[PDB]
Amino acid sequence: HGAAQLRALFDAPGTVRIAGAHNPLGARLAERAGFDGIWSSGLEISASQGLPDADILTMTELLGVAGSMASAVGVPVVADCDTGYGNANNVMHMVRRYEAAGIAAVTIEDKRFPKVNSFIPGRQELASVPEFCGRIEAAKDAQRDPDFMVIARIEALIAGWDLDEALRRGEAYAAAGADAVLIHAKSGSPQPVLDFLQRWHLPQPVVVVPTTYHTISAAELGAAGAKMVVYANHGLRAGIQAVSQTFETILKDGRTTAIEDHIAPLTTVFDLQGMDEFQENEKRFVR
Amino acid sequence: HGAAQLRALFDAPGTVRIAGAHNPLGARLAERAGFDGIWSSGLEISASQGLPDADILTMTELLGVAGSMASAVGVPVVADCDTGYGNANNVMHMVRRYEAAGIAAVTIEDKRFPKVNSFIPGRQELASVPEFCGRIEAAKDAQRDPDFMVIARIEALIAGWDLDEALRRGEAYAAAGADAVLIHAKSGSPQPVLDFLQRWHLPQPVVVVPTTYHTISAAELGAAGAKMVVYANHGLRAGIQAVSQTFETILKDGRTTAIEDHIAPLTTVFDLQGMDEFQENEKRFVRGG
Amino acid sequence: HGAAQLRALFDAPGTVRIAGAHNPLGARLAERAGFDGIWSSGLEISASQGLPDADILTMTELLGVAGSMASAVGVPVVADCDTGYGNANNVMHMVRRYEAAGIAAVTIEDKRFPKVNSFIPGRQELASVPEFCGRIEAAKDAQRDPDFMVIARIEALIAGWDLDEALRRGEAYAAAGADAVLIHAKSGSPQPVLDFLQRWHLPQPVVVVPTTYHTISAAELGAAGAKMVVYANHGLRAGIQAVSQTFETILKDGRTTAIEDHIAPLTTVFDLQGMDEFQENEKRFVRG
Amino acid sequence: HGAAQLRALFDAPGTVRIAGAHNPLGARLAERAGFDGIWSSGLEISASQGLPDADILTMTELLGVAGSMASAVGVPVVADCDTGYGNANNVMHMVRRYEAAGIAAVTIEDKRFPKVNSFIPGRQELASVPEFCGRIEAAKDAQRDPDFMVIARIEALIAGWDLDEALRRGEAYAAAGADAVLIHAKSGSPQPVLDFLQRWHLPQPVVVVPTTYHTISAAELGAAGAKMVVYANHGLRAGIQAVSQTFETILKDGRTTAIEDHIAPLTTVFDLQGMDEFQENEKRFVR
Ligand SMILES: O[C@@H]1[C@@H](O)[C@@H](O)OC[C@H]1O
Ligand SMILES: O[C@@H]1[C@@H](O)[C@@H](O)OC[C@H]1O
Ligand SMILES: O[C@@H]1[C@@H](O)[C@@H](O)OC[C@H]1O
Ligand SMILES: O[C@@H]1[C@@H](O)[C@@H](O)OC[C@H]1O
């Protein structure tokens, strides 16, 4: 149901908000909290494996997570697919396997393989516009259901280019068939993204990821012209802080008693596992 | 080196403490905090996949996590292997694959496949002693490095049998070749496990998992006769509470600003990903024409 | 799509023939030869991994192959699912994952976990009828598309029980919701399976696997009442013989020249990989 | 034991011969026939999955096969690792994972990601010498056991360059630390490869893959100066022919009777599965 659900979110009024996750449990927590969908974060999934976010994990590993989350929740999954895992032929294979796994949208960025993630310091190399437009065209040609979305992510500002270049690239990617564009920035100031949104005059919706420019609200981003806001890695970052503090306290105290009232009870874990339904089906069918 | 490291921990004085994890990042956080090793928790791993802890995930999926953690950290991984994934022949296949993946020890419990999590209420079925002893013998026969450990987990108290039955089973499992035994209990009082520890007289060390009887300290458990203490699911439970609250706050506030100072900074994530070494190696070896 | 295709094969007249395969290439060869569908054989897949056919491979490993075959060919895949990988809760999990991966039908047999391959000698242990009927009921409850099929495999004759017992079990499995039954036997004579078909009065179709009683044709089995005939492991057995002989000849001769005219050319491999389309798409979309 | 075994083969007199395989069964058949080791073939594995040999399969998928073969047989596995799955940092991650899985040697080629099977027509793109030397240096820095081997595969002839270019590339790769070089060629004549061997004066050994120039014997290649000869895809090609003919015959005849005496009996399959030892262990431990 994923791609149909995401199209309905884009076709209805209001700002769409999605949250990063790196396993089915995190996706289920975001769904329960009330997010509209899931972002299958390259950073969260890489970090969960103890590894760089630099196409060190393969498409097989990243798709494995995205697909397991897609089947675990009833909201759409939007996948972070780095640069598309190679050339236009890799992109087509990517689309076929992500679409078949029920992912609603895939996001590819205008860099070359292997991904240099946005937080690497210094000038960064961009893919040429003709080569990246070929990847976008190939993605649209490979998909089977028209509801599936291909999101073209613009790293021009990240890489050291100006807003004119970011808009030139976004307009080319839209012309190549991208269903949405994602303008990225790593400044504290939201102003470069607000400027992009104000100058964007094509019908394709714009996606934003306010990791660094966090002071701007989803409502303000929506009023400025963004359709979807991605909270990409806050679950991971919250988990790291809570788990390291928990482990430190257990070792220092020599027991868990002081943290028992500050962590999830086992009954909450069992609920998140679906144990009520599991036990009912055991009663019905296990003889 | 995991198996050699775990044997050193058991052969040295002091109480060994290990923490549950369900991916390499959790294992690395436990190592950095100072735990002696990792517990590859069936509960944590199944919960992370949104699924019951009931042999719904397969050995393939559980080994994938245990092995990725074993290569990610420099402390031993002790694996929770449910009932051994079938009969003694499945147990042998399990030992071969887990040992090759660098896991230091595997734990199999005296129940029948598929596992019922110990916190399932009501009376639970135990494996017969001859059948489970064969699983233990098969495991010791399949391993290649003598340092590798097979831990026999005793669910007799969980299932509602008495202390003498738990002791009869543990002693049979030790005679069958288990390197250690794990006595489990789900009461809030530590006395049931304390009673087992006082009456255990064999040389094999005893493992305990104080999830429910959490008020007893590791030092007290060690003084009573336990050699290893397992904190099996507190990382998962802490993570669930924090992530839920984070997601709730982001949706309510309309932005993340109010939790930025209460979650790990990006630079901490990068450190945990190994980016210092990665960027050094990029500078050393990645070059153009 | 697989399940609807398989229903169409069962709803139209004629004997359905499927072949065993253990990777997408084998499935594609079976499709090109003209088989109606694929059998995702536990024996072929376990043997391909050098391992016993005894639930040593896990559901994850067996599903990975079945699902990759289902996406690679345009004929339905019928999966060999051993005993269902545990109790009725495991069976439900299996159905959800196999259906999502586009498998058309799953086959579970009335034995206990872990499976003993039907060719293991001596008396074997059967699941109780109530317990197995619970697995069948759970499977039907877990599926989403009504076209998906659950095939109940009867091991009663394999295990040493008589025909009355195989029929009692088959009739119970049909009443529990199985879409088809598979009656197995391992003698050289087809008579035990023919005797079953003579006494089968239920509308559910019957599946047969004539590995040992190979002298009866698919058309003779169909004339006797069977609907689907499974050739379960002949591709693996042919490949083993040919690859062993090829390896021995290369070592003896010192070169491959004497076998070049008797093995597939690389152009055939490229065609099986879809290189014509791959190259066209490179021309259309890979740009500087 | 694999890396030590392969070193012993390279250190002893004689020409090493290995055969391609794409699963543990095929490796076991090569071992039983008497091959010295296994070539974990990118063409055979991709083909077995119905897909192009063009880095469409990922490192995860290719390593899964190579590692399962390495633990299934008692001869060394030499892995076909395409271009190394990205840049020098991908190469390092590859080495760490392949070495931990017991693979004896990895082979990377001097092309850019994603590769094209050498049998693609026209001038092909080579990696620059500095960039590829950096991959080799990284691979050698990442390995832990000195017995593990990194084989530098030279695609210059495949790509339409002359012998002088293939030799100068090989010479640079050897100085960068490659343990052996593989000279590839797709002529029917063996003479280009013989001429490379005559003109190669360096101590690093040379690997050859006589797929197209199949008329030269292993003994003749060894006498000309090659140390290892790879029969890369004959098992797959023999299997395809036999399986297609088997399926055609079953459909035409209506039964398998006419092929029963011409395919492996089930007892041979059981032996290859290890059933004798499996049954003994059943008797020993299953109670
Ligand atoms: O794995 C995570 C769990 O441990 C916790 O942190 O909450 C969300 C999950 O993604
Ligand atoms: O996935 C987890 C991450 O989100 C955090 O919770 O810290 C430890 C990891 O296991
Ligand atoms: O899977 C293959 C089997 O079918 C046969 O062809 O011999 C070699 C194996 O690799
Ligand atoms: O992998 C196999 C290939 O080697 C050949 O044997 O034909 C069928 C395939 O399944």
Secondary structure percentages of chain D, helix, strand, coil, to 5:
50, 15, 40
The DSSP string of B216-275 is: S-HHHHHHHT-SEEEE-SHHHHHHHHHHHHHHHHHHHHSSSGGGGGGS--HHHHHHHTTH
Q: Is D180 in contact with D149 (CB distance < 8 Å)?
A: yes
Contact between chains at D240 and C32 (C-beta distance less than 8 A): no
> Which residue does chain B place closest to D97, by CA atoms?
B71
C-alpha–C-alpha distance, residues C211 and C220, integer Å: 15
Report yes or no: C129 and C169 within 8 Å, Cβ to Cβ: yes
Strand partners, D183: D154, D208
How many domains does the structure of chain A reveal? Answer: 1
Bridge-based pairing of strands C206-208 and C228-231 is: parallel
Instruction: Please give the Cα distance from B68 to A159 (Å, whole number).
Output: 33
CA distance A59 to B280: 25
- C-alpha dist (Å) from residue D274 to B60, B92, C52: 21, 13, 7
The dihedral built from the CA positions of residue D239, D241, D245 and D248, taken in this order, carries a sign that is positive
The minimum-distance atom of ligand 3 relative to the CA of C44 is 4
B134-168: burial string, b at 16+ Cβ within 10 Å, e else: bbbbbbbebbeeebbbbbbbbbbbbbebeeebbbe
Task: Say how many Å lie between the CA of residue B186 and the centre of ligand 2.
Answer: 26
The alpha-carbon radius of gyration of chain D (Å, integer) is 20
CA distance C59 to chain B (A): 7
- Which residues are CB-neighbours of B235 under 8 A, at least 6 positions away? A243, A246, A247, B19, B20, B21, B22, B26, B29, B30, B44
Resolution (A): 1.7
- Which residue's alpha carbon is at the smallest distance from atom 7 of ligand 1? B240
Active site residues of D: 53
DSSP class of residue D111 equals B
Q: How far is D142 from chain B (nearest CA, A)?
A: 10
The dihedrals phi and psi of A281, each to the nearest 5 degrees, come to: -70, -30
Residue nearest atom 9 in ligand 2 by C-alpha distance:
B26
Q: Nearest chain D Cα to B281, which residue?
A: D89
Which of the residues D49, D58, D82, D95 would you substitute to probe the A interface, choosing the one with the greatest number of A C-beta atoms within 10 Å?
D58
CB nearest to B281's CB, from D71, D89, D281: D89
Mutate to test the interface with A, among B209, B255, B278, B287 (most CBs of A within 10 A): B255
Bin D116: left if φ > 0, else alpha if -120 < ψ < 50, else beta: beta
Residue A94 burial by CB count (10 A; 0-12/13-18/19+): exposed, middle or buried?
A: buried
* B162/B159 Cα distance (integer angstroms): 9
Residue nearest to atom 7 of ligand 2 (CA): A240
C-alpha C15/C-alpha C8 separation (Å) is 12
Q: Which listed ligand is nearest to A272 at the C-alpha? A: 1
Nearest CA to C237 out of D273, A85, D42 is that of D273
CA distances, B38 to each of A40, B33, B60 (Å): 27, 12, 19
Q: Is-contact B63 B101, C-beta < 8 A?
A: yes
User: Tokens in use for B270?
Assistant: 């990068």
User: Are A54 and A117 spatial neighbours (Cβ–Cβ below 8 Å)?
Assistant: yes
Q: DSSP E strands: which ranges in chain B?
A: 16-21, 37-40, 77-80, 105-109, 149-154, 180-183, 206-208, 228-231
* Chain D contact set for A59 (CB, 8 A): 58
D238 Cβ inside 6 Å of ligand 4 = no
Q: What is the DSSP track for B32-51?
A: HHT-SEEEE-HHHHHHHTT-
Alpha-carbon span B268 to B287, nearest angstrom? 28
Q: With beta carbons less than 8 A apart as the criterion, state whether D137 and B281 touch.
A: no
Cβ-Cβ contacts under 8 Å between B and C: the total is 40
Q: Phi and psi at residue D37, in whole multiples of 5°?
A: -175, -175
Q: How far is CA D116 from the centre of its chain?
A: 16
Residue by residue, DSSP assigns A84-103 as -SSSHHHHHHHHHHHHHTT-
Measured in angstroms, the CA of B159 and the nearest CA of chain A are apart by: 17
Q: Is the peptide bond before C114 cis (omega within 30 degrees of 0)?
A: yes
Determine the Cα–Cα distance for residues B108 and B93; give it in Å rounded to an integer: 13
Q: Residue A223 contacts by C-beta under 8 Å, 6 or more apart in sequence?
A: none
> Tokens for D151?
């084989």
Residue A236 belongs to what H/E stretch? Answer: helix A234-253
Least CB–CB distance from D255: residue in C26, C218, C268 = C218
Element (H or E) spanning B30, and its range?
helix B24-33
Q: In chain C, which residues have their Cβ closer than 8 Å to the Cβ of B61?
A: 58, 60
Ligand nearest to the CA of A65: 1
Closest CA to B230 of B77, B45, B53, B38: B38
Are D181 and D152 spatial neighbours (Cβ–Cβ below 8 Å)? yes
Nearest to D281 among B92, B287, B288 (CB): B92
Closest to D64 in 3D by CA, of C43, A58, C80: A58
Our CA dihedral for C164, C170, C172, C175, rounded to 10 degrees, sits at: -140
Contact criterion met (CB below 8 Å) for B174 and B204: yes
| Residue D109: closest CA among D163, D164, D159 | D159
Contact C273 D53 (CB under 8 A): yes
Quote the minimal CA–CA distance from B67 to chain A in Å: 11
Cα–Cα distance for residue pair D131/D112, rounded to 1 Å: 10
What values do phi and psi take at C222, rounded to 5? -65, -40
Query: D10 CA to chain A: closest CA distance, Å?
Result: 32
| Cα B202 from Cα C186, distance rounded (Å) | 51
Q: What is the DSSP letter of B127?
A: P
* DSSP labels, A25-87: HHHHHHHHHT-SEEEE-HHHHHHHTT--TTT-S-HHHHHHHHHHHHHH-SS-EEEE-TT-SSS
Question: How many Å apart are CA A12 and CA A14, to the nearest integer?
Answer: 7
- The question of whether C53 is a catalytic residue gets the answer yes
- Of B72, B56, B60, nearest to B24 by C-alpha is B72
Is the Cβ–Cβ distance between A66 and A77 less than 8 Å? yes
Q: How far is CA B69 from the centre of its chain?
A: 11
φ, ψ for residue D157 (rounded to 5)? -70, -40
Decide: helix, strand or coil at residue D195.
Answer: helix
Residue D109 falls in which region: left (phi positive, over 0), alpha (psi -120 to 50) or beta? beta
H helices of chain D, in order, are 2-11, 24-33, 42-48, 59-72, 88-100, 129-142, 163-175, 191-199, 218-224, 234-253, 266-272, 275-285
Distance CA D153, CA C143 (A): 50
Q: Is the dihedral of CA A76, A77, A83, A89 positive or negative?
A: negative
Rounded Cα distance, B127 and D3, in Å: 43
Enclosing domain of residue B84:
1-289
Q: Are B63 and B102 in contact (CB under 8 A)?
A: no
Residue D185, SS3?
Answer: coil
Amino acid, res. A29? L
Helices (H) and strands (E) in chain D, counts: 12, 8
Q: Which of C215, C238, C251 sits opposite D242 (nearest CB)?
A: C238
- In DSSP terms, C79 is beta-bridged to C40, C106
Note whether C119 contacts D266, CB cutoff 8 Å: yes
**Residue C104: CA count within 13 A, CB half-sphere:** 26
Tokens of C285: 């979309």
Q: One-letter amino acid identity for C271?
A: D
Selected for mutation to probe chain C from D273, D275, D278, D280 (highest C CB count within 10 Å) is D273
- List of chain B residues whose C-beta atoms are within 8 Å of the C-beta of residue C54: 89
The HSE-up count of residue B44 (CA atoms within 13 Å, CB side) is 26
From first CA to last CA, the distance across chain C in angstroms is: 37
| Location of structure tokens 């269902």 | C84
CATH number where B192 lies: 3.20.20.60
Neighbouring CB atoms inside 10 A of C252's CB total 10
What letters, b where the CB count within 10 A reaches 16 and e where it falls short, cover C127-152? Answer: bebebbbbbbbbbbebbeeebbbbbb
Neighbour-count burial of A126, counting CB atoms closer than 10 A to its CB (0-12 exposed, 13-18 middle, 19+ buried): buried
Ligand number with the minimum distance to the CA of C23:
4
Distance in angstroms (rounded) separating the CA atoms of residues A221 and C121: 71
Tell me if A56 and D89 make a contact (CB, 8 A cut-off): yes
d(CA A154, CA C32) in angstroms, rounded, equals: 44
Q: Is the dihedral of CA C197, C202, C205, C209 positive or negative?
A: negative
Give C197-202 contacts, CB < 8 A, sequence gap 24+: C197/C224, C197/C225, C197/C226, C198/C224, C198/C225, C199/C163, C199/C167, C200/C167, C200/C170, C200/C225, C202/C170, C202/C171, C202/C174
Closest CA to D85 of D117, D114, D51: D114
Q: Method used for this model?
A: X-ray
Residue in B51, B236, B248 to alter for ligand 1 test, most ligand atoms within 8 A of Cβ: B236
- Residue D51 in contact with residue C273, Cβ under 8 Å? yes
CB contact under 8 A, C238 and D32: no
Q: Please report which ligand is nearest the Cα atom of D263.
A: 3
**Could you tell me the two tokens for B133?**
């002893």
B272 ligand 2 Cβ < 6 A: no
* Residue C10 CB burial class (10 angstroms; 0-12, 13-18, ≥19): middle
Tokens of D81: 């690792």
Residue C167's alpha-carbon distances to B17, B124, B193, C150, D160, in angstroms, are 57, 34, 52, 18, 69
- Residue C155 to residue C161: CA distance in whole angstroms: 9
Interface of D with B (CB under 8 A): 71, 87-89, 92, 100, 102, 128-131, 134-135, 137-138, 141, 278, 281-282, 284-287
Q: Report whether B136 contacts B150 (CB < 8 A).
A: yes
Question: Is the C-beta atom of D2 inside 6 A of ligand 3?
Answer: no
**Phi, psi dihedrals of residue D276, rounded to the nearest 5°:** -60, -50
Q: SS3 for D145? A: coil
Q: State the sign of the Cα–Cα–Cα–Cα dihedral A13, A19, A22, A26.
A: negative
Name the CA radius of gyration of chain A, rounded. Answer: 20
Select which of B53, B55, B82, B179 is catalytic.
Answer: B53
Is there a contact between C207 and C184 (Cβ–Cβ < 8 Å)? no
| Residue B206 contacts residue B197 (beta carbons within 8 Å) | yes
- B264/A240 touch (CB, cutoff 8 Å), yes or no: yes
Residue pair D197/D228 in contact by the 8 Å Cβ criterion: no
Structure token digits, residue B145 = 């490095």
CA-to-CA dists, residue B43 to A49, A151, C46, C130, D29, angstroms: 19, 36, 29, 30, 41
Q: Which residue bears the tokens 């820095």?
A: D141
The C-alpha atoms of residue B31 and residue A66 are separated, in whole angstroms, by 28
Element (H or E) spanning A156, and its range? helix A156-159
The answer to whether the Cβ–Cβ distance between C60 and B55 falls below 8 Å is no
Q: What are phi and psi of A262, to 5 degrees?
A: -120, 5
Closest to A241 measured CA to CA, from A229, A233, A253, A252: A233
Q: What is the DSSP letter of B115?
A: P
Q: What is chain D's length?
A: 287
Cβ contacts of A85 on chain D, cutoff 8 Å: 58
- Whole-angstrom distance, CA of residue D96 vs CA of residue D99: 5
- How far away is chain B from the Cα of C132, in angstroms, using its nearest Cα? 15
Contacts 24+ apart (CB under 8 A), C257-265: C257/D214, C257/D215, C259/D234, C259/D238, C260/D214, C262/D238, C262/D241, C263/D234, C263/D237, C263/D238, C263/D240, C263/D241, C264/D236, C264/D237, C264/D238, C264/D240, C264/D241, C264/D244, C265/D237
Coil, strand or helix: which one is D91? helix
Q: Tell if the CB–CB gap between C114 and B54 is shorter than 8 Å.
A: no
* Nearest CA residue ID for atom 1, ligand 3: C48
SS3 per residue for chain C:
CHHHHHHHHHHCCCCEEEEEECCHHHHHHHHHHCCCEEEECHHHHHHHCCCCCCCCCCHHHHHHHHHHHHHHCCCCEEEECCCCCCCHHHHHHHHHHHHHCCCCEEEEECECCCCCCCCCCCCCCECCHHHHHHHHHHHHHHCCCCCCEEEEEECCCCCCCCHHHHHHHHHHHHHCCCCEEEECCCCCCCHHHHHHHHCCCCCCCEEECCCCCCCCCHHHHHHCCCCEEEECCHHHHHHHHHHHHHHHHHHHHCCCHHHHHHCCCHHHHHHHCCHHHHHHHHHHHCCC
